[PDB]
Amino acid sequence: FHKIRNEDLIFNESLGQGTFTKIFKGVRREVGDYGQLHETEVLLKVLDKAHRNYSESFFEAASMMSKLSHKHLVLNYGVCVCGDENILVQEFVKFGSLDTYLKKNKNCINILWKLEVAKQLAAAMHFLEENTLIHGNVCAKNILLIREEDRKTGNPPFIKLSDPGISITVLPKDILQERIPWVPPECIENPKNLNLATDKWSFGTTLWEICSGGDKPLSALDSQRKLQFYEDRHQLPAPKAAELANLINNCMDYEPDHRPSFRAIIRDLNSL
């Protein structure tokens, strides 16, 4: 990771928080191409000082993403580890996370929008699967909307997958349980079961989010009831707009070996 000086970063408004992290809009002063000076909008992800022990997993998350280059994977500019802070410096995506975009735009997002976003996510996960790289935290909050759909120009929406954050292989047990049903049942049983098949399950959950206008599946269940949901081998309800319901359940297969490759997922998406 390229090291960025604290003096070159300006922290502006908070944009929320993630697991043991706080998120800020910021500005990076930098010398760019041809020696031109730029003041670039950036997304600054700050690991909580009280959780500095998760720094290696905080940064191994992004670093994996950033050893590969792909149009659907978020760009990391570098890190700032001056002083006591652990900061990931990331491209700033105009329209933020998909989970909140889906909510604020329910009565405006149709099946063709959801299908194109689903295809793009499948393309990014296919690229990861071909490179045998595990993401570990596929969810709507981790999908960034680069570009809105512009019907008047034929332009589809364009999304990127963000970095996974601290791995579920080191997170507290209660956080993992609150992440049901994104975290697969085999990883609730044993977090060290994290596997390429993990992302197939979470991709199913993420499609459910995309089809459900920002609702969180099982949000009404507390952690104990979510565990029992897995113990009784339940599937999620079909979204009202059920066009993707079969793919969702096919991906969320309690047998990890039976979950379809992302190539087959793309083939099924292209038939709708």
Ligand SMILES: N#Cc1ccc(Nc2nc(N)n(C(=O)Nc3ccccc3)n2)cc1
């Ligand atoms: N209101 C508003 C707003 C919020 C965010 C953004 N933009 C933006 N750009 C990036 N790269 N982003 C994230 O990686 N986010 C994130 C993902 C997971 C966990 C925590 C944060 N988020 C733009 C607008």
